[model samples]
Target chain A: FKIDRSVVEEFLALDPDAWERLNADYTARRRIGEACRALSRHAFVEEDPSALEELHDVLALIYQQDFSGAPVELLGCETQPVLRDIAAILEGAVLAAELDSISEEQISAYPRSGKEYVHWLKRVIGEHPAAGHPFYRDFVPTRATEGDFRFYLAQETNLDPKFDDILAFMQIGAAPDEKMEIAGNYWDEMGNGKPAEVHTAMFAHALDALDVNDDYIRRNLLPEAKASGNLASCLAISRRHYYKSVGFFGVTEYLVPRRFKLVVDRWADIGLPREGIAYHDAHISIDAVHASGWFKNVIAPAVDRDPRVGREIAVGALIRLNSSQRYLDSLLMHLHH
Target chain B: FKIDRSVVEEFLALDPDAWERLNADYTARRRIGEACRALSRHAFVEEDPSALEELHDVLALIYQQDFSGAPVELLGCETQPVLRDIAAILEGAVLAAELDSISEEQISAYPRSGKEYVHWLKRVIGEHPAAGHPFYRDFVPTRATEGDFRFYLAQETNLDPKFDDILAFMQIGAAPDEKMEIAGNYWDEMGNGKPAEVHTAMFAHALDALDVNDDYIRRNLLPEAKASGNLASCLAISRRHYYKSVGFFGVTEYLVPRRFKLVVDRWADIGLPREGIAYHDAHISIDAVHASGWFKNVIAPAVDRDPRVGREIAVGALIRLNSSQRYLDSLLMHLHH
Candidate 1:
């Protein structure tokens, strides 16, 4: 049965800013959809239906939204990955909307393989909405009030839901040799078995100071966070190849520290209690190493250990990057303009 | 006596704000400066005195400021690379003054090489005081009148000293085989011999619309532009290795397109004339291709061909990156808050 169009139509109508954004979302999906459509018709599909099906499977949400405006259920799990994709297309649409059509130029500004993804991740952040977002530009210590920052700082609480466990789960898929890197990364988040220094504990400290005691704010959860874990679970859930989780885990490592550094510098410059926002500061310093190392040790090597796994790595990168926008846009919406 | 602490003492007193800034400036310089100092003492110095001295030469501008606090004499002539270093440190000091000290951690958030300079560049721009410098942020299209944008947009005439020609000069220094990327980059600036579309002409179009005729806007540039041209000339001087020029050229490519894209989005979204700011729009698209190619094909390979050349590339990247902060601060300082 077809999903009703009215839910989307109403959402579009309610969001006056949706015109250009909705266009870009549909356009990115259309561009990818057309590629898949052609693939379905092309010889590539005939030679490797499994790869073709997987590509189509990951993007089913795009076509689902394109064809049916109502939400499409995959497994109906709480942290459904499909919902994250849909939300990303909706909220993050604004990010890519302004970008002109990128023809496959001399080279893709993006990665063709997950192995050398840090360089690609670096450029990708600059292009993301968060790079130039008002949320960051506005929330510094100088211009913002304690409450103004608290709402925003609490946003990092998305990590509370056993995020490191997900990292460990992600490691299960790594090739034995690649496990060293994945486990090395996972070890840090597990608090090095020193619970106080664990990654999420830092986020907890940040959340407490922000007074983010509301169910959503104090709790480290999200469909954005939920999707973060759940989509991660899609990659990790025993039956799935560990490479997919490793790929997803590895790519976020590329993004987190640079962003955390921006948070640290702006907040520190503005004269905030650094301890209150210590999680970001910690990641800013910790991930400086983690981000690049994960590229060589985990993500790149995961793909290197198996060429076909590049597909998993690339798709995983795309998935997290898109949902990441959802979380960024979500906080940006609530932050006082 | 003792270069009269009072000359600098007076300037520091005059710009009481400088007291805070001078500290940040000296700190950033010390970080970069001390690297040069240690290198000067190391065994590498004995083997490569010229390179070491040139580097020492760059930081002497730093130490000079750190010491005498007087501006050094550098010519107003062509691309004298050394003079560029002197002027840049003098002018760009304002940019870094507001930044905090970077701590040693897992890795510098920046690449030890220029491969991932964006993370460094991003933090550098933030510390630059220009990111939120009232100049660009304050000049929104919708809230602004015609006259408002005119003065600010014209600031880019900083390219006045035939910056494109200097780019061509940089190309002249590349390894013979590396000429393809350099020339390919150069060919665009020439705009296939259609002079109007050549990079700088768009600046001229922008200038005319802003009504910055041959006087204040045109017929040359800012102390910022003056510093800019003098700086590029440093890389271009015939005696310098082609590697240095290419490295400098490559680093700015990363910054330009991203920033231009920001300017284009903010301005165009606010309902202004796109053509008047066509120079920004032009780079937003072109540099997408231009940035990456220059890095891998020209900049990276130049260093790869001779690992020691990495110093030239790194230092060259530093000069441009720092000067970019100058042009930014200069514009911020002058533009209305």
Candidate 2:
């Protein structure tokens, strides 16, 4: 059932510019952006095990480019430009395709105006399948063994290091007021500038205490887990999907506090080292503080300025919600067996 | 007499590429980067009022380009590329010139190892002339009239809006460890994602209470006031000056708490609205928290990796110190009269 790279390998060479340039011969025309999205949606949302494996392969390539830092070879020489550029171009095509991955009916189910949209988003998240998933709401707290906890903890570590970078990219070129909100969210993730207090360091500390070594974590990692994070990076790094990034991130901030509290409770319940719970414990309160402003300052205002932004944001949130459901389901399957 | 813009106007037409490309000229050799820096240093640090005025014009242009958002025209059309390209090219040349503006002797006066350099920086800032400036330490706390307070307040407002953006740029392309530290510093500035608590919003709140309208702020703004901020933007946005930006910004975070505390005391003494004092009062504590990590996590690690980073950071700190002294001196002269 392992997915083959050949699924998306051929499309990789299709010039990304075909999506942007226009033509007169296309009177009954379609933009290449839409075509990319349509093909991507078909590939991305399939439930067949073989298709899902292919999706993960596609996602692996998407993230490699999304997380890169300042161009290294440029300062030293020019060996890597074309290679990096090809990856970057492919990244754009994949991310655009992700937008159309969610059905239009699902995206339209949410509200449209800014304040109303935010209110609806808040209501929806509480009832979201991911939010109410029994994994967090019940099993981890009441029935999970140490191995279950470790399995869960291992999956969580993948994205912890890169969250602040995601927010940094999200805030770029945002309107002044909106930029401040994103910056504020990024700062909380930074642990308010304290090295010992940084959120990533705290998570790493927990992982260390839990004996979640890099090799063990990597072996246990799941494609569904990878998909959740890659989706976030995809939304954030691309300009075409900038509004979607905003919504996706806003929902994440909104979603974490409650689930984090559940994990913290389980950590304490099982008599795990007190320090092992620090990351979840801190975010329990910090994310609550962040969620309120994320919706009010970061989300609502942009929606007010443009209804289209609100619609895109709703879709982004749904994308996160959909991905989270799959992410947890995969974890559940691995843990229960 | 006011300075004329024509002094640097002729050089503006010179291709910015002259600074980046290298060649084997007749026998002796030189890179144009050094020539640009030498010319800039002479112009930037000169005390003559006329030369200073021209420096501000140059600075104004530098900032306009530095603070721009996502390329607006590219999303809409192609009308702005050449215009922005011209300004961007000029921006590089001016920023390059600024590196040489500080004399080599001045830049070499600090330690070169990371931990040792940080310790030296902490001590130097405490004794730095800017930290002990009479305008903040004496005049603001105990001095004259409401009018005087208004005048000083207006100048302080110039850079408040953009500090987080400065941090965002500084963290880019930084190593994983260093990026976390910068992100932490930036998050503290974000007031941990709370809008009312955002450092910029808090500053705006204070300004509103004190009646610092945009028009009032503009009328009283001095070239000296603009130069300090322009210097920050110059260092943050340009890669060449990045280590220096870190040093410059670290000094600022280190320097602000003591000075901000003094201003807070003045705000309380004059019975200014409690809400108006939120920004100054918050930073009095928050910045102290920020400065410690900024030196430890952000500055030292980079120095450990490269001694060149350490020296450049030192120069950056000195640049801020020198500029602040000039900035305060200008305010004092204007206020006393």
Candidate 3:
């Protein structure tokens, strides 16, 4: 039952369409592959030592951190079984892509490649020998050998838990928060003097704008557009003008000043010093200017260029508006009730 | 330059400690004043009809919108000027705070509330003041005793040009993106694959039995804490646990599966998904559980504990972690590079 390099190659040589579909749907997979290739090309063309070093570092990190470690308990369960299945599938597909024809006998043969090939071959062997593994699935063709290998690669990458972890790690603390207090005293010293009421009003106004614009787009614009997709998809493509992303970039600036002031005033009223209100105070004018510049330079230009872009902007804007609005609503609701 | 409230009886009617501090802080210029009985506790509270209506609307939308419109723009601006000045003084000391304070006042007042007040008052008086109008510099504060003894309530709001216009209207899109993609779809579907990740994980691992172990303490915790503060503050304090206002709650769940899968697979080539592969798929298990349970049981506990508590769980989390690590370090670093 052990799958070999030949078996993988046979699988890869089995289908072409699967590869194309995966390439089209997954952006992150494509981008990562492209980045790797670009780096490879740079290393080869420029003979750049630094590029080579960087590549080595990346590979080493991937190998050391990603490939060799305890079976991390996912939601408290061992994920090795699932990973093995995915890897076996990838191995079979990679082999199929390298070979023109694949057969039972051919697949049974061991690979004689370098370390990377050996590394892959071992996993394929372990997975193939196991029952109820990915390779044991009925969908995995036993004999067919006319597929594109890259499709398997793309599929495997998309399903890779490592990739997902990396992405999650990257996004860990991107949103706003108060632990910002410990990192520096800026927030504690300056943040409290913000005017909560005023910021809340502005946030409400922004939401009104989004609701009106979204309604306009959904009801008025989509019917006339000749897009070949579902309403959500088509609107997503067109909602740029109404739901601008750049719009949120400025919100922090607009809201921070007043909120910071409120915090400062509250703290002052309670006899707390400047240190406690640092965060809001620091952000007050800084974000104000930042929000202003973003609106004028980044957002305005995008809206002015195309209505569709404006819709996109609106969508983006709505996200932040909703968030701010929700925050305010919660505070006020709690206070009143 | 000092603020004085009318009604000497009302002034002397507050708690002795409150008046003591007020007098000490303000440095009373008049003769010694005798304390009077506190104003009848039954006196009516001033209520703004429109504001009340708005509040009602806001309350209805609180949970639906997660309290997004809690803060208002007018209040934000009015409170921000003084807060910013205070913050500046605290950080940069009195001189720096003063210098920045003057400039900020000039900018905010000229463009926003002050301008609006001038325009509305002039319009009422049948006068149109244009740029460089004679009344601009000559305007002075209307004392409470002067001009028919009529007092006008001017709603002060911050108006950052960028956010007050079209740009602020667009930022709402980013708000939903992460929620829908990561929190909604990824967390709910791929990560936890259940009603709640923690519950699911516990169910899977037979750990649900552990829930009852701490039930007594958990159930009684809120009320006991509430004895010190009002119900609101108690609730606010308790909500912190579910949302993790100071730390990353779900990140470990997100990272473990994939990281473990990657590490395992890389070493043995045993073709297992042991590396960080399963981490992403298993992410949000805890968050889902926390979100659901917190809202259901914990929220009630909080409310029972505090009457006026504004639950800022999500905001507190974001403020504590995301802004600095994810946004400042990772996202901003990428942009900087």
Candidate 4:
């Protein structure tokens, strides 16, 4: 509960050699690159601003996890030399692009040749010694045969019962009975289409994407280095940054409601024999409403109460946007190549 | 609900003349000096760190309010001028003695005339054109014989019910039932030691003192006005500063349990009637338990979830500490003038 420096140190100690391994694993890196390209291509082909935004969220997830942790560790005075070195590499790469320079054209020209892109990604990861370990190997494999990768992606997109349980617990603040009832209601609402299991998986996948996105931004973009200023002063600055990102994240849900809607419509269009398109269809509309509520209820009020949070949120959003754009560019380049 | 730049602007507009008046109020300024002396004398005489700390809190109330406000028209954009000035004065006075450049013998030889101090205070207040306006006159006496100023000082020793209510409401997320229950409990606790009417009057007095204190600090101190960089960046910095203060205010219940206990014991030893000690006594025990619970259950967890909030709390604590020290100095000057 106390989130002391040790907690962060422990998390970082998960893989000491991961950085180097990640950089070296050409095949695995290529797979990850390909995955990113696929996801980015999906967004570009959709040509929907909302889809683009959702893609941005996904990109944010990667960046935050990759970059932000070191600064936070430094702030707590727990940053290891290795972590600092890794952070510098990542930060330098991100800073290389001029501000607002990564436009649609850049994104459209991104390398998307799944094999080559994956290899490039592997090189990047391999450069970090810590990325070579088994955990990293399992967690961030770069090379998968096309068929195997597609299968993996399919599984990721589909829902599992455990995911439902997790969502329910989180939604109701871990109140068991309440969460159970909510879960039941959710299950019933999903109707007879595509087995309640698949719908849940898809929804969970989207939510997972969101969570990763939030984490990524928190890790990479916000200022986490401690200064001589009072703790409260430092915190206020941090909070502003956080809330600004929340505002942007809230906006992203609006852009992705149609994706959920499409999934539902696809079931109907393909004659997949699903009883409730209503539930699937309702998600887009309902999520849009929920997203609007977040903007109105959570974002601005939080910012007003604490401007520090707002600044952090804004920084987080920018990181997410840039990461998404980079992924898009890589995908396009690969396809053309 | 949404706090914006406009809201901040409106708050600034509340006392356009406050800074000028405060600057002119030589009597009020002297009263501040007297207050400091009284506090310091109490600390030195009793050697009660707890009481000294309490006095410090009072001083903080004054300093935070006085210096964090907009500067006088002459002082221009120097926010928290009074606080900075006080700190400078105290540092000069105290540090010189510590270094033996200004001997303790010289300090002891200084005039200890209460009447002279009061007269000086009056002159400061009278000189300030806006000092006696209804909006800004709460601390200044309306009639010399009414002892209103003394009453105001006494009132500052206690919590402000309305502010407490606002904080409680915010903490409980504005659950109406919870808010009402808290209000009822507070009232009931106050009424236990005296006639309900008398208790109500005392409560109102406390509330008035808090209001005046807050107004004074906001208007005179202008804590949010002094920024180190560009205007927008500075504003951002200032806003974060304000948020840190708010965070401290919000966490008050968790910060002062030991002092509350001391207050109850002291009041009892003074042979104050049970009714007179009700509020202090109740909080002494209640807040002891409440503070622990709050820190463990709420503050710790909240901060853990959001490091930014943790930072805000730290800043708030620093401001509170600095303000309290200044207030103690003022009280010491008053008592030993």
The top-ranked prediction according to lDDT is 2
DockQ of 3: 0.01
TM-score (C-alpha, index-matched) for candidate 3? 0.19
Off by over 4 Å in 4: A1-98, A102-247, A259-287, A294-322, A325-337, B1-215, B218-292, B295-337
Highest-DockQ candidate: 2
- Residue A324, model 4: lDDT of 35
TM-scores, each model vs. reference = 0.33, 0.60, 0.19, 0.29
Which ranges of candidate 3 are over 4 A from the true structure?
A: A1-243, B1-337
Candidate 4 TM-score, true structure as reference: 0.29
Task: Return whichever of 2 and 3 wins on lDDT.
Answer: 2
What would the per-residue lDDT of candidate 2 be over residues B141-191, giving only the tens digit for each residue? Answer: 788466777787788765777787777767765776888777766766666
lDDT of 3 by residue, B1-337 (tens): 2111223224324453444343332112111110100111111122333332222222222111111211211111111111111111121121121232222222222212222322332232122122112111122111111110111000000010011111111111112221122222223322222323322232222211212223432332221121111111111112112222111222222222333233223323433223222322343353355333323333233223332221222222222222222212322222223
Decoy 1 TM-score against native: 0.33
- Give the per-residue lDDT of model 4 (tens digit) for A228-335: 011111111121122323423443333436444545544454443244344446567766765545444444444444333433334333443443334333322332
Q: What does candidate 4's lDDT look like per residue over B1-337, in tens digits?
A: 2222342234334452564354334444445444444444554455456434443333343232322211222212212323322332232222222233222332232122333322332343234332222311222212211222233334343334333222222222111222223323333323322343323345444335334454553333211111100111111122222223233443445434444454445445544445544555556566666444444444444444444444444444333333433343343334334
Model 1 segments more than 4 A misplaced: A1-126, A130-134, A214-230, A236-244, A266-274, B1-337
**Cand. 2 Cα-lDDT:** 0.65
Considering TM-score, where higher is better, how would the candidates rank from best to worst? Answer: 2, 1, 4, 3
- DockQ score of each predicted structure, in the order shown: 0.01, 0.12, 0.01, 0.02
In model 3, state the lDDT of residue B93.
22
Model 2: CAPRI class: incorrect
